[PDB]
Design brief:
The structure is a homotrimer. By secondary structure, chain A is mainly β. The first copy, chain A, contains no helices and 7 strands. Chain A starts with 8 loop residues before the first strand and ends with a strand. Chains in contact: A-B, A-C, B-C. Strand 1 of chain B pairs parallel with strand 1 (about 10-20) of chain C. Chains A, B, C: This is Alpha-synuclein. Chains A, B, C: Belongs to the synuclein family. Chains A, B, C: It is found in: Cytoplasm; Membrane; Nucleus; Synapse. It is classed as protein fibril.
Amino acid sequence: VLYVGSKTKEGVVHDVTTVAAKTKEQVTNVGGAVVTGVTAVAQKTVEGAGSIAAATGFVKKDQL
Amino acid sequence: VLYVGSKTKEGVVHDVTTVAAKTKEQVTNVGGAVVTGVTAVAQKTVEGAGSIAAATGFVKKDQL
Amino acid sequence: VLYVGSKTKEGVVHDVTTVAAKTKEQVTNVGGAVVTGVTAVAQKTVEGAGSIAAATGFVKKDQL
């Protein structure tokens, strides 16, 4: 009766490897979003109306 | 009666490898989104109306 | 009675390898979305009306 229960991985980010030698960036930003990098987001549950989950480089401008 | 239960991987991101030598970027952004990088998003559940999940380089402008 | 239960992988992204030598980018963006990079999104469930899941380089402008 071994492992009668779970042995799982839910919403998992592992063994992410990155090797970026050079980024000679002249980044000019005027009222905007720029994303230059490793972004790991692991979630199990997100709920709600109008909800944003794991947004990267986002620009939200509502005339509401 | 081994492994009578689960041994699973649900919503998993693993063994992602990246090797980017050079990006001599002259990034000019005026009121917008730019994304230059590794983005790993692992989720199990997202719910709700009007919900955004795992958005990357997003621009939302509503006249509502 | 081995493996009477699951041994599965649901919504999985693995063994993604990328080797990008050079991108001498002159990226000019005016009120828009640009995406230059590795994007791995693994999900099990997304629900709701009007919901956006795993959007990349998105521009949403509604006159509603």
